[PDB]
């Protein structure tokens, strides 16, 4: 059990605790270089290229220069290492900034300035207004009555509203002064550190008495103090034991699914490479036994038994056949990846003009995985919405207002101007004052509330625990009914610039089950008004029979409901003098604890609010981001499932679900109570929710279902598996009241139990854990902290830019990568397997079929540019046609363009191209090509012709592969052949290429390699055209 | 974040381009014009190849009942053979004398690199310092081998003469030129004699001959322009072969001053000085006489190949045409 002793730095130093410094980075100045461990081992290609480098080092078994594989391996390893060094050094700056944050600490007898590192468990601290909470502390005292504190938990959840926090009653009256805090010696035996943010179990031992503790008295690290001059608390969890850091995940290394596919399909090439070399090695042992031992011209001294000669060339044939897995593939993918990323950076249709924030590709390695997304897990507030929540319409008295019929707001100086109200009749009616209901309506909004004033620098800012109330008070303020300030006994409100300080005699509290609030205020004349405001259903239960506007307001509410607006009913009363005096005595008798204080308070609360007079209703709009409902429909057409993971309330989350059209009237909403029975039923025995299509669950219910011995572990995987099956059989899933770790748990659950490619999008620190956990992580820009942005692979500002990232950039990056991989392997299996065929005609001696200079420059100068440009410019359809047809996204979702079948089909194509490129020239020189003093079918001519036919054939194949024939694409394909034939014509090889039989041999080889390929390409599309082909044809 | 991206075609992914679609109006023609070009070329090469007169004599004599088996085991080192052959059709124009070796892997890795091109280029430093490439034949006893390597060592050292057995039965000797049988670049660029001096004897001072060579490289030919590293026979040999079965140019029979055929039809005798042993590795020596053609040499593989590829291209177009029309 945890144990904290205040003002005792040596209590439990007798390891288990943690200092209040944070280590988010992953590397030091020394252990960074061992990053080679991660690079080398995870990608077996790097290990194979390492083996080749060693294998080419020893002169005993060597056929190619090792300088040519060290330089690219350094480039391959260097760039990836450089990328992770910039990523890690950035994490060093954020850790240093947080760790150097300032806080006041109880030194010996006084409060002194200190940094966030110096804080430790059992340390008493003092925090001021707008100061970050440096650790999970226990509130001891505050600058306002009852040791009250308001805190903004914007990193625990994405909400900017204030959270109420109270301290222990005993500590409130004693630890007010600095003197008593310094000598304070409180012992706490609380829970062990965990990731739970809503629950806290513990007790405070002090003054020979034990006081239980709750989460209301505990301020957590990721919070900010607001609306209180200062507060004091003792650190309980520090640094890494804090619930904010237990609600965080490791920065894992993210690599694409295609990256895993190349790994498994490069294993097979290794098997092929070893099997080929072993087979050729065996033949040499047999060949050297019969033909090589009796061949006097092959004598070279140093008698080696045929078995040893076979053993020796096995390593010669690994080196000869090394480009079965070429190092240029991974050098060029880094060029493709970097260029594809910069198109996201450069996009103007993902550039937010007014915030001047373009899209950013912070991770350049995952571009083609954007075309693979199966699921999207999105934050709600700031991601789907704007965090703007304004007053849109109102039904006051009977008539509905805010219909744009016929604002300056200069008639009242308090109007901040935020409100975008358009109707002018309301403003005319307010100034005219021809109807008391209008003045009474906006008065209620500016009095019946819990909002608090700032009055800092002469600005009348409002901070509220309920975003609904904050908007209503702002609306009333804009309409002249400015809530100036409030003390304990009286509330001050300005009416048309006239000061009017009223005295409040009671403030009915607001509860989730209560669904309403009221305030009883005595007017200066003496009249008592019970200004009540609450939910639509509860209010109508308490209506006087005289109310004639009941039906009309109900009709107005239906109009507002259809717009998915938030509505609240407004009411006053006219309680009498003696009646309140009798009740005021009764009300005080109910405030005492007595037995429970809940039944009595509810009883008196019920009787207060009977027979009320309706004023109508309000209409608050929780603004969505532009193009959000269009985005959700567009991505839904692409078969992408969008899940909303929010720290907000269920009611707010469900309201935005309908506003986003994620939920419609067709959907039936399943709740945690409904889910639990369905899951429980399956244990005692696809899910019926396959037809329900909606799922609204709370973070509290996630733990109940997730349940966070061997038989117990069996039920853990079973219950998690069933939930993922149910949640995946639903059109929309909204998880609410979830902590930052619970967000990543849901993303993880889909990853493990569905093997789906997941995207996580959000803003603020609440979403960093799931942005780090998903396959792709997007960070919405706008948070000054920039915590989701700096932990994300990509970061734009508007949610609607998800359309172009996935359907345009992600779709093309998948097409442009699979096209790149299939050709690049093709061009290198055709290249290198000519050596395999020549082994049957040179004693299996590992003699290369090309000149040494051709082998080095093949993937550098002759087949390099065309495939890189095709990997950076190839579009099957335009961007407009990409968004107009989201169904083209299913191409990558189903993994169609890169497979074992697609990969092996490029093995056969390379195998057959090498076969033709060697055996047509072989037949042409088995029959004595162009015999004369200038062409005796030498070896150089054999090498030059196959290389000449190889360069043309592969460079034509990329031309047939390219669909977006830009000029730079045309120049590269033709320039590669022109460059090749320009190098070997004085800027041996020239002699062969001046003779008709040599050129007619190349033409025959090139056609026999390409001309069949046109047949399958044309035959396949005609019989089985692709969706891109149909759009291209109909373009 | 930062300012607006600049509006350019490349960065905005809107570069002008063409979207070529493999339509039946584009692939079907190229599948038919190819078949209409490959057939006439296939016929043109095939007919020209079959219009080339050529005779190939296998004088290794491994199989008994041949008048050269005595030289398989030459108890006396100078061994000679006489093979009589008849040319039915008179050869016309220039006639080339090639010798052919079978199952002689001149492309072997241990054999191809066994040379010092720097020495063959005529480098004084490499003249007396053979490279490790020609390791087994760098030096004989104390001083280095001038043509070092398995290549120069195993040079073809047979001698071939042809006589016309006329009506009188008296063998008329036949002129055979040994110049101009190698690449121009090989004679003048790739191969050169060491610099300095006037006589080849002093230039190759302190350099042993190859062990298998009967005589040194000083006087490979009487003409100083054909002796040393620039010898035509030696140069032709060093130009290794791509495949085990190959033939190398030996002598040229230029056009006769008279209008009569260069090698008139009749009885011919091949007088060969059997020197090169090939029967250990089951290799076959041959002598080839062939006549020049305005399209190079003889190659029925290619001519037949275009007929097959050209015909298949024509047929593939028809098949593609039928598939298209059914799926139109
Ligand atoms: C006229 C038109 C055409 C002009 C054309 C102009 C020229 C082309 C210009 C640009 C296109 C990209 C060219 C680079 C292609 C990859 C190079 C490569 O892999 O070479 C490798 C070796 O060469 C090198 O050392 C170069 C490495 C550094 C490359 C720097 C990249 C810069 C990219 C700039 C892009 C700008 C792009 C800008 C775009 C706007 C090839 O190795 P391997 O696979 O053939 O064989 C390996 C290994 O290498 C050893 O050989 C060993 O034998 C081992 O066993 C074997 O497995
Ligand atoms: C033509 O070339 C052949 C090579 O195929 C020559 O045969 C080779 O001759 C050398 C020496 O003349 C032999 O080397 C050594 O000779 C000594 C005798 O001095 C012998 O006892 C050793 O055992 C060793 O072989 C070599 O073995 C031999 N090779 C073969 C395959 O016979 C031939 O001499 C050349 N003839 C002419 C006329 O140029
Ligand atoms: C070949 O010719 C020579 C002389 O010309 C002669 O001695 C020999 O008998 C002939 N052999 C055959 C088989 O004709
Ligand atoms: C063959 O050539 C040799 C060498 O010059 C010569 O001695 C002989 O007379 C020629 N004729 C034969 C062997 O019939
Ligand atoms: Mg948010």
Please, which contacts does B5-9 make with residues 24 or more away whose CB atoms are closer than 8 Å?
Answer: B5/A345, B5/A346, B5/A347, B5/A348, B5/A351, B5/A358, B6/A346, B7/A348
- Residue A726 CA to residue A687 CA, distance in Å, equals 6
Please give the full DSSP string across A292-320, using - where no structure is assigned.
Answer: ITS-GGG--SS---HHHHHHHHHHHHHHH
Residue B82 lies in a domain: yes
Asked whether the beta carbons of residue A939 and residue B111 sit closer than 8 angstroms, the reply is no
Closest Cα in chain B to A1008: B309
Question: Residue A743 annotated as binding?
Answer: yes
Q: Does domain A360-384+625-795 have CATH number 3.40.50.1580?
A: no
Q: Which residues contact ligand 2 via a Cβ below 6 A?
A: A 296; B 154, 157, 211-212, 214, 275-277
- This structure's resolution (Å) is 2.6
Could you tell me which of A805, A807, A961 has the C-alpha nearest to residue A878?
A807
Please give the full DSSP string across A909-955, using - where no structure is assigned.
Answer: HHHHHHHHHHHHHHHHHHT-TT-STT---BHHHHHHHHHHHHHHHHH
| Atom nearest to B155 CA in ligand 2 | 2
What tokens were used for B3?
Answer: 């300012």
Residue B248 lies in a domain: yes
Q: What is the fold of A388-573+609-623?
A: Calcium-transporting ATPase, cytoplasmic domain N (3.40.1110)
B138 min Cα distance to partner chain A (Å):
11
Using an 8 Å Cβ cutoff, are B48 and B302 in contact? no
Asked whether the beta carbons of residue A296 and residue B280 sit closer than 8 angstroms, the reply is yes
In this structure, the answer to whether residues B42 and B62 fall within a common structural domain is no
In this structure, the answer to whether residues B311 and B181 fall within a common structural domain is no
Contacts with A1021 from chain B: Cβ below 8 Å: 22
Beta bridge partners of B241: A938
B114 half-sphere exposure, CB direction, 13 A CA radius: 26
In this structure, the answer to whether residues B79 and B208 fall within a common structural domain is yes
**Counted domains in chain B:** 2
Tell the residue nearest (CA) to atom 39 of ligand 2. Answer: B214
Neighbours of A458 (CB within 10 A): 5
Place of tokens 């550098």: A860
- Indicate the domain borders of chain A: 4-11+119-246, 360-384+625-795, 388-573+609-623, 811-1034
Question: Residue A646 annotated as binding?
Answer: yes
Residue B4 lies in a domain: no
Size of interface A-B (CB pairs under 8 A): 245
Ligand 4 mutation pick, B78, B80, B161, B176, max ligand atoms within 8 A of CB: B80
- Residue A977 CA to residue A521 CA, distance in Å, equals 90
In this structure, the answer to whether residues B120 and B269 fall within a common structural domain is yes
The DSSP output letter for A391 is: E
Closest Cα in chain A to B300: A927
Q: Angle CA(A849)–CA(A851)–CA(A857) in degrees, nearest 5?
A: 110
What tokens were used for A33?
Answer: 């270089």
Q: Which residues contact B224 (CB under 8 A, 6 or more apart)?
A: B200
The minimal CB distance from B305 to the residues A357, A1004, A1029 is found for: A1004
Q: Which residues contact A677 (CB under 8 A, 6 or more apart)?
A: none
The DSSP output letter for A254 is: P
Distance between the two ends of chain B, CA-based, in angstroms?
Answer: 53
The minimal CB distance from A936 to the residues B27, B108, B249 is found for: B249
What tokens were used for A622?
Answer: 């929780």
Annotated catalytic sites of A, by residue? 379
The minimal CB distance from A931 to the residues B6, B31, B297 is found for: B297
What tokens were used for B113?
Answer: 């690199």
In this structure, the answer to whether residues B202 and B324 fall within a common structural domain is no
Residue A382 sits at φ, ψ, to 5 deg, of 85, -25
Question: Residue A874 annotated as binding?
Answer: no
Using an 8 Å Cβ cutoff, are A125 and A119 in contact? yes
Question: Residue A131 annotated as binding?
Answer: no
What tokens were used for A469?
Answer: 């109330």
B84 lines ligand 3 (CB under 6 A): yes
From residue B137, give the alpha-carbon distance in Å to each of B141, B151, B212: 10, 10, 10
Residue B309 lies in a domain: yes
In this structure, the answer to whether residues B83 and B62 fall within a common structural domain is yes
Distance B252 CA to ligand 2 centre (A): 29
Distance A379 CA to ligand 5 centre (A): 6
> Mutate which of B3, B100, B108, B325 to disrupt the A interface (most A C-beta within 10 Å)?
B108
Using an 8 Å Cβ cutoff, are A127 and A231 in contact? yes
Question: Residue A469 annotated as binding?
Answer: yes
| Atom nearest to A327 CA in ligand 1 | 44
Distance A176 CA to ligand 2 centre (A): 114
3-state DSSP helix/strand/coil % of chain A, to nearest 5: 50, 15, 35
In this structure, the answer to whether residues B323 and B227 fall within a common structural domain is no
**Nearest-ligand number for the alpha carbon of B84:** 3
A534 half-sphere exposure, CB direction, 13 A CA radius: 26
In this structure, the answer to whether residues B36 and B183 fall within a common structural domain is no
Residue B15 lies in a domain: no
Residues, chain B: 328
In this structure, the answer to whether residues B168 and B37 fall within a common structural domain is no
* Residues of the domain holding B28: 23-52+299-328
Residue B213 lies in a domain: yes
Closest Cα in chain A to B6: A346
Using an 8 Å Cβ cutoff, are B108 and A847 in contact? yes
Q: Angle CA(A817)–CA(A818)–CA(A824) in degrees, nearest 5?
A: 85
In this structure, the answer to whether residues B79 and B210 fall within a common structural domain is yes
- Residue A716 CA to residue A503 CA, distance in Å, equals 58
Q: Does domain A4-11+119-246 have CATH number 2.70.150.10?
A: yes
Residue B2 lies in a domain: no
Residue B167 lies in a domain: yes
- Residue A158 CA to residue A222 CA, distance in Å, equals 11
Q: Helix A67-99 and helix A327-346: axis angle, to 10°? A: 40
In this structure, the answer to whether residues B211 and B288 fall within a common structural domain is yes
Q: Which residues contact A783 (CB under 8 A, 6 or more apart)?
A: A382, A763, A764, A789
Way the structure was solved: cryo-EM
Contacts with B102 from chain A: Cβ below 8 Å: none
The counts of H helices and E strands in chain B are: 9, 9
Using an 8 Å Cβ cutoff, are B105 and B247 in contact? no
Q: Helix A710-728 and helix A740-754: axis angle, to 10°? A: 90
> Mutate which of B1, B30, B103 to disrupt the A interface (most A C-beta within 10 Å)?
B1
The DSSP output letter for A752 is: H
B269 lines ligand 3 (CB under 6 A): yes
Q: Does A388-573+609-623 match A360-384+625-795 at the fold level?
A: no
Beta bridge partners of A114: A103
Could you tell me which of A50, A354, A260 has the C-alpha nearest to residue A775?
A260
User: Alpha helix locations (H) across B51-147?
Assistant: 109-112, 117-120, 124-127
In this structure, the answer to whether residues B75 and B147 fall within a common structural domain is yes
Distance A158 CA to ligand 5 centre (A): 4
């Amino acid at each position: 059990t945890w144990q904290v002793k205040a003002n005792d730095r040596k209590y439990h130093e007798q390891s288990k605790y943690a200092n209040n410094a944070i280590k988010t980075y992953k590397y030091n100045a020394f252990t960074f270089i061992p990053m080679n461990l991660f690079e080398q081992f995870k990608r077996a290609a790097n290990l194979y290229f390492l083996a080749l480098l060693i294998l080419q080092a020893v002169p005993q078994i060597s056929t190619l220069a090792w300088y040519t594989t060290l330089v690219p391996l350094l480039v391959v390893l260097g760039v990836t290492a450089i990328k992770d060094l910039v990523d890690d050094v950035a994490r060093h700056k954020m850790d240093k900034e947080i760790n150097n944050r300032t806080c006041e600490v109880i030194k010996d007898g006084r409060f002194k300035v200190a940094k966030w590192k110096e804080i430790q468990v059992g340390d008493v601290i003092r925090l001021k207004k707008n100061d970050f909470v440096p650790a999970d502390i226990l509130l001891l005292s505050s600058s306002e009555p009852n040791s009250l504190c308001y805190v903004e938990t914007a990193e625990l959840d994405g909400e900017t509203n204030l959270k109420f926090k109270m301290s222990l009653e005993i500590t409130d009256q004693y630890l007010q002064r600095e003197d008593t805090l310094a000598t304070f010696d409180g012992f706490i035996e609380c829970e062990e550190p965990n990731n739970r943010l809503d629950k806290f179990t513990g007790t405070l031992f002090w003054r020979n008495t034990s006081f239980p503790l709750d989460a209301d008295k505990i301020l957590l690290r990721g919070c900010v103090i607001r609306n209180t001059d200062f507060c004091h608390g003792l650190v309980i969890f520090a640094g890494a034991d804090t619930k904010i850091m237990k609600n965080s995940g490791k920065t894992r290394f993210k690599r694409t699914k295609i990256d895993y596919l190349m790994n498994y399909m490069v294993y097979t090439i290794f098997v092929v490479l070893i099997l080929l070399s072993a087979g050729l090695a065996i033949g040499h042992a047999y060949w050297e036994a019969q033909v090589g031992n009796s061949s006097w011209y092959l004598y070279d001294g140093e008698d080696d038994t045929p078995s040893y000669r076979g053993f020796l060339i096995f390593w010669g044939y690994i080196i000869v056949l090394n480009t079965m897995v070429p190092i240029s593939l991974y050098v060029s993918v880094e060029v493709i990846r970097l260029g594809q990323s910069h198109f996201i950076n450069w996009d103007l249709q993902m550039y937010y003009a007014e915030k001047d924030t373009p899209a950013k590709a912070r991770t350049t390695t995952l571009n083609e995985q954007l075309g693979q997304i199966h699921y999207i897990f999105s934050d709600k507030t700031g991601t789907l919405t704007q965090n703007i929540m304004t007053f849109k319409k109102c039904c006051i008295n009977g008539q509905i207002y805010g219909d744009h019929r016929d604002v300056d707001f200069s008639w009242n100086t308090y109007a901040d101007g935020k409100l975008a109200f358009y109707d002018h009749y309301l403003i005319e009616q307010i100034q005219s004052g021809k109807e008391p209901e209008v003045r009474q309506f906006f008065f209620l909004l500016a009095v019946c509330h819990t909002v608090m004033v700032d009055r800092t620098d002469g600005q009348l800012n409002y901070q509220a625990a309920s975003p609904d109330e904050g908007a209503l008070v702002n609306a009333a303020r804009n309409f002249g009914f400015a809530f100036l300030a409030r003390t304990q006994n009286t509330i001050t409100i300005s009416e048309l610039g006239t000061e009017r300080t009223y005295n409040v005699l009671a403030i009915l509290d607001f509860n989730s089950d209560r669904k309403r609030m009221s305030i009883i205020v005595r007017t200066p004349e003496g009249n008592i008004k019970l200004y009540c405001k609450g939910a639509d259903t509860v209010i109508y239960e308490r209506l006087h029979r005289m109310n004639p506007t009941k039906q009309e307001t109900q009709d107005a509410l239906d109009i507002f409901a259809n717009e998915t607006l938030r509505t609240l009913c407004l009411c006053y009363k006219e309680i009498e003098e003696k009646e309140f005096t009798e009740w005021n005595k009764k009300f005080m008798a109910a405030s005492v604890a007595s037995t429970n204080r809940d039944e009595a308070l509810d009883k008196v609360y019920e009787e207060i609010e009977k027979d009320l007079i309706l004023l109508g209703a309000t209409a608050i709009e929780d603004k969505l981001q532009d193009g959000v409902p269009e985005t959700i429909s567009k991505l839904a057409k692409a078969d992408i499932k969008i899940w909303v993971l929010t720290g907000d309330k269920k009611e707010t989350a469900e309201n935005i679900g309908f506003a986003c059209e994620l939920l419609t009237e067709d959907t039936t909403i399943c709740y945690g109570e409904d889910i639990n029975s369905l899951l429980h039923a399956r244990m005692e025995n696809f899910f019926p929710p396959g037809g329900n299509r909606a799922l609204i669950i709370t973070g509290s219910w996630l733990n109940e279902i997730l349940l966070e011995k061997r038989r117990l572990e069996a039920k853990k995987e079973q219950r998690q598996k069933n939930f993922v099956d149910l949640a995946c059989e639903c059109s929309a899933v909204i998880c609410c009241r979830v902590t930052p770790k619970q967000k990543a748990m849901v993303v993880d659950l889909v990853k493990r139990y569905k093997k789906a490619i997941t995207l996580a999008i959000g803003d603020g620190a609440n979403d960093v854990n799931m942005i780090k956990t998903a396959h792709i992580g997007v960070g919405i820009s706008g948070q000054e902290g920039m915590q989701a942005v700096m932990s994300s692979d990509y970061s734009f500002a508007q949610f609607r830019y998800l359309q172009r990232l996935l359907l345009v950039h992600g779709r093309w990056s998948y097409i442009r990568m699979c096209k790149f991989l299939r050709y690049f392997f093709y061009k290198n299996f055709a290249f290198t397997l000519v050596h395999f065929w020549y082994s049957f005609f040179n004693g299996y001696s590992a003699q290369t079929a090309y000149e040494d200079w051709f082998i080095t420059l093949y993937n550098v100068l002759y087949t390099s540019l065309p495939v890189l440009l095709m990997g950076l410019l190839d579009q099957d359809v335009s961007d407009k046609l990409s968004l107009r047809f989201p169904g083209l996204y299913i191409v990558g979702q189903r993994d169609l363009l890169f497979n074992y079948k697609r990969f092996f089909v490029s093995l056969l194509h390379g195998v057959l191209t090498s076969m033709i490129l060697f055996f047509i020239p072989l037949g042409a020189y088995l029959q004595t090509v162009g015999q004369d003093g200038e062409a005796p079918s030498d070896y150089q001519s054999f090498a030059v012709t196959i290389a000449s036919a190889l360069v043309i054939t592969v460079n034509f194949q990329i031309g047939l592969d390219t669909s977006y024939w830009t000029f730079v694409n045309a120049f590269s394909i033709f320039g590669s052949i022109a460059l090749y034939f320009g190098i070997m014509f004085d800027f041996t090889a020239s002699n062969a290429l001046r003779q008709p039989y040599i050129w007619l041999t190349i033409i025959l080889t090139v056609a026999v390699c390409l001309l069949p390929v046109v047949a399958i390409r044309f035959l396949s599309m005609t019989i089985w055209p692709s969706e891109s082909d149909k759009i291209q044809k109909h373009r | 974040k930062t300012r607006r991206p600049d509006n350019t075609a490349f960065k905005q992914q809107r570069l002008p381009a063409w979207q070529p679609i493999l339509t039946a109006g584009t692939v079907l023609p190229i599948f038919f014009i190819i078949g209409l070009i490959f057939i006439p070329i296939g016929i043109g090469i095939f007919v020209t190849s079959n219009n080339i007169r050529e005779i190939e004599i296998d004088y290794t004599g491994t199989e008994p009942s041949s008048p050269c088996n005595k030289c398989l085991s030459p108890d006396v080192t100078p061994c000679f053979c006489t093979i009589n052959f008849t040319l039915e059709k008179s050869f016309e124009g220039n006639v080339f004398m090639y010798y052919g070796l079978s199952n002689f892997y001149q492309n072997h890795r241990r054999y191809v690199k066994s040379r010092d091109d720097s020495q063959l280029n005529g480098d004084s430093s490499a003249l007396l310092n053979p490279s490790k490439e020609c390791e087994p034949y760098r030096r004989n006893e104390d001083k280095p081998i001038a043509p070092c390597g398995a290549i120069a060592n195993s040079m073809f050292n047979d001698t071939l003469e042809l006589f016309l057995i006329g009506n009188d039965s008296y063998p008329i000797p036949i002129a055979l030129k040994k110049k101009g049988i190698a690449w121009w670049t090989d004679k003048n660029v790739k191969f050169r004699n060491p610099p300095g001096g006037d006589n080849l004897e002093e230039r190759f001072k302190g350099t042993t001959k190859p062990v298998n060579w009967l005589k040194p490289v000083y006087m490979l030919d009487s003409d100083p322009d054909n002796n040393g590293f620039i010898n035509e026979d030696f140069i032709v040999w060093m130009r290794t072969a791509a495949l085990p079965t190959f033939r190398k140019l030996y002598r040229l029979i230029e056009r006769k001053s008279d209008l009569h055929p260069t090698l008139p039809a009749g009885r011919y005798s091949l007088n060969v000085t059997y020197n090169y042993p090939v029967h250990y590795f089951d290799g076959r020596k041959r002598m080839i006489l062939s006549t020049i053609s305005w399209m190079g040499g003889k190659n029925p593989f290619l001519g037949i190949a275009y007929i097959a590829v050209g015909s298949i291209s024509f047929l593939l177009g028809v098949v593609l045409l039928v598939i298209n029309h059914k799926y139109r």
